[PDB]
Symmetry: C2
Subunit: 439 residues, 2 copies
């Protein structure tokens, strides 16, 4: 096979992507060992779906799991009557998701389960894949001539040839695994053929963070979760929290081997210690550094010039409401709250008007990082921690460190009942989710 493993791509044909996937326990080889994972399409990750604006997607999900499941079309601004977070597909049953890809859309999205209380074990076991909306911007020469790859960042732990079960501590912290994989492979080699790489990045982990750095190189951010930036942004490192996506250009500067690493990052995970008192929670501290892949540069690399511009960000109408959503924790209970409450699918927490813009102030009053996700309605991050964001782009997950306030500009798009929640999916399963109704 190619030195660099990537999921198989399924492309729309004639404007239609019609596909049946099964969600099924699947024996496979993973990281040099045999294991049974839960997969879409018989692979880990699931197949990458590649579409264009105004394509029709018709995806029939067959549930071959022993428990109910469903799909969240993470990041897609479509109707919550399709991206339906309350729908349950029973074992053995099927459901067809059908939607049209919005016209003004580009980037890397993904699909995974969203059946409340069962997301974390289903996502941990292997149920996820990517969806790429390809754009007319892809034809500009500075992107067309780049070498493109998708990197699905997802970790795993195996016990007895199956995904390791969740412990109580895992429900508190979010589960991380010791196998830190790219596209389901352990530290693959990317032997670059071109001097400019375009890398679509997806954090499809339950809880692990990836503080990304490429040895000896900056990265050029060109898209956030839900769309292009207005122009490339040079960064020395890039933090992707669970559920976030980004696209970067890499301009290889000389021949050689360069490690792409997940550098040490402390997200606030907790352990327990007994030091002659009795059992007390103690910080785990920063993650151990991980090598994600080996990047081999071609001979005498001469990277393309960067694009001068990407996509202008829409001018949004003035907002009509300001919301405040406060995140708190009860760590020893593994319970997580928004404005003092746990999720209740019968309770509507926020009511807004379609086609207006709202300002959401989300405040992390906990000690862990929490990556806040809103379904259906992509947002513009104005500031986090009191610092203005350095670019304009559509996002749908925003990471909050302890104490920080994010200010979001939220245009409300499709009508219906949807949700917002922490994308440490264990925290969603344990209550950190609420209901938005748009009318």
């Amino acid at each position: 096979g190619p030195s660099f493993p990537e999921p198989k791509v399924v492309r729309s044909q004639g404007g239609l992507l019609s596909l049946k996937l099964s969600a099924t326990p699947t024996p496979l080889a993973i990281a040099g060992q045999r294991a049974t994972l839960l997969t879409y399409g018989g692979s880990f990750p699931g197949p990458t779906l590649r579409v264009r604006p105004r394509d029709t997607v018709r995806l029939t999900l067959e549930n071959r799991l022993p428990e109910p499941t469903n799909l969240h079309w993470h990041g897609l601004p479509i109707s919550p009557k399709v991206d339906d977070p309350f729908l349950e597909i029973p074992p053995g049953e099927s459901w067809t998701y059908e939607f049209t890809v919005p016209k003004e859309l580009a980037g890397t999205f993904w699909y995974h389960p969203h059946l409340h209380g069962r997301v974390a074990p289903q996502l941990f076991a292997g149920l996820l894949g990517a969806l790429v909306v390809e754009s007319s911007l892809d034809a500009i020469p500075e992107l067309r001539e780049a070498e493109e790859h998708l990197l699905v960042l997802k970790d795993l732990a195996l016990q007895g040839g199956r995904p390791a079960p969740h412990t109580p501590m895992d429900w508190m912290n979010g589960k991380e695994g010791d196998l830190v994989l790219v596209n389901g492979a352990l530290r693959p080699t990317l032997v670059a053929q071109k001097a400019t790489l375009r890398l679509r990045l997806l954090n499809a982990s339950n809880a692990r963070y990836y503080r990304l750095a490429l040895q000896d190189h900056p990265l050029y951010l060109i898209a956030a979760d839900g769309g292009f930036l207005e122009e490339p942004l040079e960064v020395s490192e890039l933090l992707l929290a669970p559920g976030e996506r980004a696209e970067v250009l890499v301009r290889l500067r000389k021949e050689g081997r360069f490690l792409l690493q997940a550098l040490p990052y402390d997200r606030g995970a907790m352990g327990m210690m007994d030091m002659g008192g009795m059992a007390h929670a103690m910080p785990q501290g920063p993650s151990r550094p991980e090598t994600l892949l080996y990047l081999i540069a071609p001979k005498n690399p001469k990277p393309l010039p960067l694009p001068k511009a990407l996509s202008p960000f829409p001018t949004l109408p003035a907002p009509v409401v300001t919301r405040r959503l406060v995140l708190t924790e009860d760590m020893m209970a593994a319970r997580f709250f928004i404005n003092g409450q746990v999720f209740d699918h019968r309770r509507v927490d926020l009511k807004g008007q379609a086609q207006t813009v709202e300002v959401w102030e989300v405040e992390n009053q906990g000690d862990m990082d929490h990556p806040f996700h809103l379904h259906v309605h992509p947002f513009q991050v104005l500031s986090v921690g009191g610092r203005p964001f350095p670019y304009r782009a559509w996002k749908d997950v925003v990471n909050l460190k302890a104490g920080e306030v994010a200010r979001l500009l939220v245009p409300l798009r499709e009508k219906g009942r949807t949700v917002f929640h922490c994308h440490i999916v264990e925290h969603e399963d344990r209550g950190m989710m609420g209901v938005l109704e748009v009318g």
Copy 2:
């Protein structure tokens, strides 16, 4: 003094730069030794004159040399009745140059002798200085906040505490010296205080080339000889031929010491060998690498973003004539020709019309590099060697390797009699110069 030596600056006051300079033999300390050089203003280099568009310059040059001399205001699009290449100031006499700085002008220029047949020994002995036209573009934050320095690249050879005399070989090749200096200093240290440096670069050597590279860093070209580029251009190295200028931004990437070097470059200089036949010319080959300065980066450097734009390049009228100027050599005679002829100050070689545009095709049919200079009328290099130039900017010297054709777009500005010549000044003194009359 400051760790980084730079010439003293003289600034216009209230719109006027009124200065008397003397050209005089001057005992000084140079590169750790005492020598007598020929200087302007008692220093080597001469003082940097710093002015703004529409300033008046009133410079009285007092000749305290034992031979006649004059000034060429290299690169300034002013009248050749002021920048007069035929004027002789006798020993002991003075002359006042008075002109207004053009409104649409910016960059690094310089002044030096232009008395035909005596340029090479006068320039080699120390007679040169810089002139900076500061621009409203200097106030954009990406330049204003950079740390600015001038680097005058000029080599020297000393014999008996004076500049070394010219040999016959030196008249053939152009003289290079073993002391390869920056601002008259030997391998100075630049201890950067800011992470972005703006470096004005001047090759004021008789003949030496500087194939510039900064260890571990690209350079961002922002101006050529006579003005800004339209936007910054990333380059891995930058060749400055005699008489050229450039301005670059340096974006320091990490703490440490980085050498700015003149890398090996073969300009076609010739030696003589006797191997049992008899005496035959043999290539000298590439220059030995030289370290120009040590660049110390500050702690945790965070460079400014590059400017997105600099100055739009003027749209020029369609040209009305195409000229062909062919450069040839008689190396053993140390004679150099344009279209078969040596300079004659009584003979007009080209006659053009003010405010028209001409295409000049300059063809190097010799084996040495020749840097072709036109007084008074800055030009746009369209292509050299059949390769399009990668930027639009005003230039006034264009380097031609053996065999290469440069195509230049030449707007004719001020009326009068002026010259064009090789800026290996030994080759000008030995005939490689001709006369342009604009009416």
